[PDB]
Protein backbone atom coordinates (compact mmCIF):
# COMPACT_ATOMS: atom_id res chain seq x y z
CA UNK A 1 0.00 0.00 0.00
CA UNK A 2 1.21 3.48 -0.93
CA UNK A 3 0.26 6.48 1.21
CA UNK A 4 -0.43 9.96 -0.19
CA UNK A 5 2.37 12.27 -1.19
CA UNK A 6 2.49 15.43 0.91
CA UNK A 7 1.74 18.89 -0.49
CA UNK A 8 4.62 19.90 -2.77
CA UNK A 9 5.36 23.16 -4.62
CA UNK A 10 7.25 22.79 -7.93
CA UNK A 11 7.06 24.12 -11.52
CA UNK A 12 3.99 22.98 -13.44
CA UNK A 13 4.82 20.45 -16.16
CA UNK A 14 3.84 21.99 -19.48
CA UNK A 15 2.23 19.67 -21.98
CA UNK A 16 3.14 21.79 -25.02
CA UNK A 17 6.80 21.99 -24.04
CA UNK A 18 9.10 18.91 -23.96
CA UNK A 19 11.74 18.68 -21.23
CA UNK A 20 14.25 17.57 -23.89
CA UNK A 21 13.87 18.05 -27.67
CA UNK A 22 17.35 16.75 -28.61
CA UNK A 23 16.92 13.18 -27.42
CA UNK A 24 14.47 10.27 -27.31
CA UNK A 25 13.03 10.23 -23.77
CA UNK A 26 10.70 7.21 -24.09
CA UNK A 27 11.19 3.88 -25.87
CA UNK A 28 8.66 2.46 -28.39
CA UNK A 29 7.44 0.13 -25.61
CA UNK A 30 6.81 3.19 -23.38
CA UNK A 31 9.78 2.83 -21.05
CA UNK A 32 11.32 6.15 -19.94
CA UNK A 33 14.87 6.87 -21.09
CA UNK A 34 16.42 8.69 -18.18
CA UNK A 35 18.17 11.98 -19.04
CA UNK A 36 18.79 15.11 -16.98
CA UNK A 37 15.77 17.37 -17.33
CA UNK A 38 13.24 14.52 -17.57
CA UNK A 39 12.63 14.02 -13.83
CA UNK A 40 11.82 15.97 -10.68
CA UNK A 41 13.98 14.22 -8.09
CA UNK A 42 11.98 15.64 -5.18
CA UNK A 43 8.83 13.86 -6.38
CA UNK A 44 10.70 10.62 -6.99
CA UNK A 45 12.53 10.79 -3.63
CA UNK A 46 9.17 11.20 -1.86
CA UNK A 47 7.65 8.26 -3.73
CA UNK A 48 10.52 5.92 -2.91
CA UNK A 49 11.16 7.09 0.66
CA UNK A 50 7.46 6.53 1.43
CA UNK A 51 8.05 2.88 0.48
CA UNK A 52 11.19 2.68 2.70
CA UNK A 53 13.14 1.49 -0.33
CA UNK A 54 16.41 -0.41 0.13
CA UNK A 55 18.83 -0.57 -2.79
CA UNK A 56 21.47 -3.27 -3.09
CA UNK A 57 24.60 -2.51 -5.13
CA UNK A 58 26.75 -5.42 -6.28
CA UNK A 59 30.35 -4.99 -7.32
CA UNK A 60 33.09 -7.53 -8.08
CA UNK A 61 36.68 -6.82 -7.19
CA UNK A 62 38.89 -9.73 -8.20
CA UNK A 63 42.69 -9.87 -8.27
CA UNK A 64 44.14 -6.41 -9.18
CA UNK A 65 40.68 -4.81 -9.29
CA UNK A 66 40.57 -4.46 -5.51
CA UNK A 67 42.59 -1.26 -6.17
CA UNK A 68 39.40 0.41 -7.50
CA UNK A 69 37.20 -0.12 -4.43
CA UNK A 70 38.28 2.90 -2.37
CA UNK A 71 37.37 5.53 -4.96
CA UNK A 72 34.31 3.52 -6.06
CA UNK A 73 32.88 3.32 -2.53
CA UNK A 74 33.83 6.85 -1.38
CA UNK A 75 32.21 8.41 -4.46
CA UNK A 76 29.18 6.13 -4.12
CA UNK A 77 28.80 7.57 -0.63
CA UNK A 78 28.65 11.06 -2.12
CA UNK A 79 26.35 10.37 -5.09
CA UNK A 80 24.52 7.01 -4.98
CA UNK A 81 21.01 6.88 -3.52
CA UNK A 82 21.85 9.39 -0.76
CA UNK A 83 18.94 9.57 1.67
CA UNK A 84 17.84 6.01 0.98
CA UNK A 85 18.82 2.68 2.55
CA UNK A 86 21.77 1.14 0.68
CA UNK A 87 23.44 -2.27 1.03
CA UNK A 88 26.73 -2.76 -0.81
CA UNK A 89 27.75 -6.31 -1.68
CA UNK A 90 31.44 -6.53 -2.49
CA UNK A 91 32.39 -9.85 -4.06
CA UNK A 92 36.11 -10.46 -3.86
CA UNK A 93 38.91 -13.02 -3.68
CA UNK A 94 40.75 -10.82 -1.13
CA UNK A 95 38.48 -9.79 1.77
CA UNK A 96 41.48 -8.27 3.59
CA UNK A 97 42.15 -5.88 0.68
CA UNK A 98 38.68 -4.28 0.90
CA UNK A 99 39.29 -0.67 2.11
CA UNK A 100 37.63 0.54 5.28
CA UNK A 101 35.33 3.19 3.84
CA UNK A 102 33.22 5.39 6.12
CA UNK A 103 29.53 5.03 5.39
CA UNK A 104 26.57 7.37 5.99
CA UNK A 105 23.65 6.38 8.22
CA UNK A 106 21.32 3.68 6.80
CA UNK A 107 24.08 2.27 4.60
CA UNK A 108 25.93 -1.02 5.04
CA UNK A 109 28.52 -3.15 3.34
CA UNK A 110 28.97 -6.93 3.20
CA UNK A 111 32.14 -8.60 1.95
CA UNK A 112 31.36 -11.86 0.12
CA UNK A 113 34.25 -14.13 -0.70
CA UNK A 114 34.22 -15.83 -4.08
CA UNK A 115 36.65 -17.84 -6.20
CA UNK A 116 40.66 -15.44 -17.38
CA UNK A 117 39.20 -11.92 -17.09
CA UNK A 118 36.46 -13.09 -19.49
CA UNK A 119 35.41 -15.74 -16.99
CA UNK A 120 35.69 -13.32 -14.10
CA UNK A 121 33.43 -10.89 -15.93
CA UNK A 122 30.97 -13.52 -17.13
CA UNK A 123 30.71 -15.53 -13.90
CA UNK A 124 29.14 -12.48 -12.20
CA UNK A 125 25.82 -13.86 -13.53
CA UNK A 126 26.07 -17.12 -11.54
CA UNK A 127 27.01 -15.44 -8.25
CA UNK A 128 24.27 -12.81 -8.49
CA UNK A 129 21.72 -15.51 -9.32
CA UNK A 130 21.85 -18.97 -7.69
CA UNK A 131 24.27 -18.30 -4.77
CA UNK A 132 22.95 -14.98 -3.38
CA UNK A 133 19.32 -15.58 -4.38
CA UNK A 134 17.76 -15.90 -0.91
CA UNK A 135 19.91 -13.23 0.73
CA UNK A 136 18.91 -10.41 -1.67
CA UNK A 137 15.22 -11.25 -1.50
CA UNK A 138 15.38 -10.81 2.28
CA UNK A 139 17.60 -7.71 2.37
CA UNK A 140 16.84 -5.33 -0.49
CA UNK A 141 14.03 -4.18 -2.83
CA UNK A 142 16.15 -3.40 -5.90
CA UNK A 143 19.52 -4.67 -7.12
CA UNK A 144 21.97 -2.54 -9.11
CA UNK A 145 24.94 -4.42 -10.66
CA UNK A 146 27.97 -2.41 -11.73
CA UNK A 147 31.66 -2.60 -12.71
CA UNK A 148 34.20 -1.52 -10.08
CA UNK A 149 36.68 0.36 -12.29
CA UNK A 150 34.44 3.43 -12.05
CA UNK A 151 33.69 6.53 -10.02
CA UNK A 152 30.54 8.51 -9.27
CA UNK A 153 30.79 12.19 -10.23
CA UNK A 154 27.15 13.24 -9.95
CA UNK A 155 23.73 12.16 -8.70
CA UNK A 156 22.65 8.55 -9.35
CA UNK A 157 19.37 8.10 -7.50
CA UNK A 158 15.91 6.59 -7.39
CA UNK A 159 15.11 7.88 -10.89
CA UNK A 160 16.75 4.63 -12.13
CA UNK A 161 14.60 2.28 -10.07
CA UNK A 162 12.10 0.15 -11.93
CA UNK A 163 11.42 -3.57 -12.39
CA UNK A 164 14.17 -3.93 -15.01
CA UNK A 165 16.67 -1.48 -16.49
CA UNK A 166 19.64 -1.41 -18.86
CA UNK A 167 22.03 1.44 -19.69
CA UNK A 168 22.96 2.74 -23.13
CA UNK A 169 26.58 1.86 -23.91
CA UNK A 170 28.42 5.18 -24.40
CA UNK A 171 30.13 4.09 -27.64
CA UNK A 172 26.90 3.07 -29.41
CA UNK A 173 24.05 5.38 -28.41
CA UNK A 174 24.23 7.13 -31.82
CA UNK A 175 24.98 3.98 -33.85
CA UNK A 176 22.81 2.02 -36.29
CA UNK A 177 21.88 -1.48 -35.09
CA UNK A 178 24.01 -3.14 -37.78
CA UNK A 179 27.02 -1.48 -36.11
CA UNK A 180 26.13 -2.80 -32.63
CA UNK A 181 28.67 -5.40 -31.48
CA UNK A 182 26.01 -8.03 -30.72
CA UNK A 183 26.96 -11.70 -30.99
CA UNK A 184 26.38 -12.42 -34.69
CA UNK A 185 27.03 -16.20 -34.84
CA UNK A 186 23.75 -18.20 -34.91
CA UNK A 187 25.52 -20.99 -32.95
CA UNK A 188 25.50 -18.84 -29.78
CA UNK A 189 22.52 -18.37 -27.47
CA UNK A 190 23.44 -14.66 -27.54
CA UNK A 191 22.85 -14.41 -31.31
CA UNK A 192 21.02 -11.32 -32.60
CA UNK A 193 20.48 -10.90 -36.40
CA UNK A 194 21.44 -7.69 -38.22
CA UNK A 195 17.77 -6.59 -38.53
CA UNK A 196 17.01 -6.90 -34.80
CA UNK A 197 18.00 -4.79 -31.78
CA UNK A 198 16.69 -1.72 -30.01
CA UNK A 199 19.83 -0.51 -28.25
CA UNK A 200 23.28 -1.69 -27.28
CA UNK A 201 23.25 -1.95 -23.50
CA UNK A 202 26.51 -1.94 -21.46
CA UNK A 203 27.27 -4.90 -19.18
CA UNK A 204 28.67 -2.45 -16.61
CA UNK A 205 25.37 -1.13 -15.23
CA UNK A 206 22.04 -2.97 -15.10
CA UNK A 207 19.48 -3.67 -12.41
CA UNK A 208 15.87 -3.76 -11.32
CA UNK A 209 13.75 -5.46 -8.67
CA UNK A 210 15.40 -8.45 -7.00
CA UNK A 211 12.98 -10.78 -8.79
CA UNK A 212 13.74 -9.38 -12.27
CA UNK A 213 17.46 -9.21 -11.69
CA UNK A 214 17.54 -12.83 -10.53
CA UNK A 215 15.54 -13.80 -13.65
CA UNK A 216 17.97 -11.96 -15.91
CA UNK A 217 21.09 -13.31 -14.26
CA UNK A 218 19.70 -16.87 -14.13
CA UNK A 219 18.80 -16.70 -17.83
CA UNK A 220 22.21 -15.33 -18.83
CA UNK A 221 24.01 -17.91 -16.68
CA UNK A 222 22.02 -20.79 -18.25
CA UNK A 223 22.60 -19.38 -21.77
CA UNK A 224 26.33 -19.12 -21.06
CA UNK A 225 26.40 -22.75 -19.91
CA UNK A 226 24.75 -23.83 -23.17
CA UNK A 227 27.34 -21.89 -25.18
CA UNK A 228 30.16 -23.48 -23.15
CA UNK A 229 28.78 -26.97 -23.83
CA UNK A 230 28.59 -26.04 -27.55
CA UNK A 231 32.20 -24.79 -27.50
CA UNK A 232 31.39 -21.16 -28.24
CA UNK A 233 32.07 -17.99 -26.28
CA UNK A 234 30.05 -14.85 -27.07
CA UNK A 235 32.07 -11.95 -28.53
CA UNK A 236 31.43 -9.69 -25.54
CA UNK A 237 30.85 -12.32 -22.89
CA UNK A 238 28.03 -11.58 -20.45
CA UNK A 239 27.37 -8.23 -22.15
CA UNK A 240 26.36 -10.17 -25.28
CA UNK A 241 23.96 -12.31 -23.24
CA UNK A 242 22.63 -9.25 -21.42
CA UNK A 243 21.84 -7.72 -24.82
CA UNK A 244 20.01 -10.84 -26.01
CA UNK A 245 17.98 -10.92 -22.76
CA UNK A 246 16.99 -7.25 -22.94
CA UNK A 247 16.00 -7.61 -26.59
CA UNK A 248 13.54 -10.38 -25.69
CA UNK A 249 12.54 -8.94 -22.28
CA UNK A 250 12.16 -5.19 -22.73
CA UNK A 251 13.49 -3.10 -19.85
CA UNK A 252 10.99 -0.87 -18.02
CA UNK A 253 13.48 2.06 -17.97
CA UNK A 254 16.61 2.70 -19.99
CA UNK A 255 19.42 4.84 -18.56
CA UNK A 256 21.06 7.39 -20.84
CA UNK A 257 24.88 7.43 -21.22
CA UNK A 258 25.00 10.03 -18.39
CA UNK A 259 24.95 6.87 -16.28
CA UNK A 260 27.94 5.10 -17.86
CA UNK A 261 30.44 7.45 -19.49
CA UNK A 262 34.12 7.38 -20.48
CA UNK A 263 35.43 10.94 -20.59
CA UNK A 264 38.97 9.96 -21.63
CA UNK A 265 37.69 8.04 -24.64
CA UNK A 266 34.62 10.13 -25.56
CA UNK A 267 34.97 13.63 -24.10
CA UNK A 268 31.90 15.62 -23.03
CA UNK A 269 29.30 16.00 -25.82
CA UNK A 270 26.58 18.67 -25.60
CA UNK A 271 23.88 15.99 -25.29
CA UNK A 272 25.21 15.06 -21.82
CA UNK A 273 24.23 17.68 -19.24
CA UNK A 274 25.77 15.57 -16.48
CA UNK A 275 28.43 12.87 -16.29
CA UNK A 276 27.22 10.76 -13.39
CA UNK A 277 29.19 7.50 -13.32
CA UNK A 278 32.45 7.36 -15.26
CA UNK A 279 35.29 4.98 -16.15
CA UNK A 280 38.55 5.17 -14.23
CA UNK A 281 41.46 4.92 -16.70
Ligand SMILES: O=c1ccn([C@@H]2O[C@H](COP(=O)(O)OP(=O)(O)O)[C@@H](O)[C@H]2O)c(=O)[nH]1
Nearest residue numbers: 059060061062063065117120121147148149
Ligand atom coordinates in the same frame (compact mmCIF):
# COMPACT_ATOMS: atom_id res chain seq x y z
O1 LIG B 1 40.45 -9.45 -13.07
C1 LIG B 1 39.30 -9.01 -13.03
C2 LIG B 1 38.52 -8.89 -14.19
C3 LIG B 1 37.22 -8.39 -14.11
N1 LIG B 1 36.69 -8.00 -12.86
C4 LIG B 1 35.31 -7.46 -12.70
O2 LIG B 1 34.62 -7.51 -13.98
C5 LIG B 1 34.27 -6.15 -14.33
C6 LIG B 1 34.27 -6.06 -15.85
O3 LIG B 1 35.54 -6.18 -16.35
P1 LIG B 1 36.30 -4.87 -16.90
O4 LIG B 1 35.92 -3.68 -16.06
O5 LIG B 1 37.72 -5.22 -17.08
O6 LIG B 1 35.64 -4.73 -18.35
P2 LIG B 1 35.82 -3.47 -19.32
O7 LIG B 1 35.22 -2.25 -18.55
O8 LIG B 1 37.39 -3.12 -19.50
O9 LIG B 1 35.09 -3.69 -20.59
C7 LIG B 1 35.27 -5.28 -13.56
O10 LIG B 1 34.69 -3.99 -13.34
C8 LIG B 1 35.33 -6.00 -12.24
O11 LIG B 1 34.15 -5.68 -11.49
C9 LIG B 1 37.49 -8.12 -11.71
O12 LIG B 1 37.06 -7.78 -10.62
N2 LIG B 1 38.78 -8.63 -11.80
Ligand SMILES: [Mn+2]
Nearest residue numbers: 147148149204
Ligand atom coordinates in the same frame (compact mmCIF):
# COMPACT_ATOMS: atom_id res chain seq x y z
MN1 LIG C 1 34.69 -1.86 -16.56
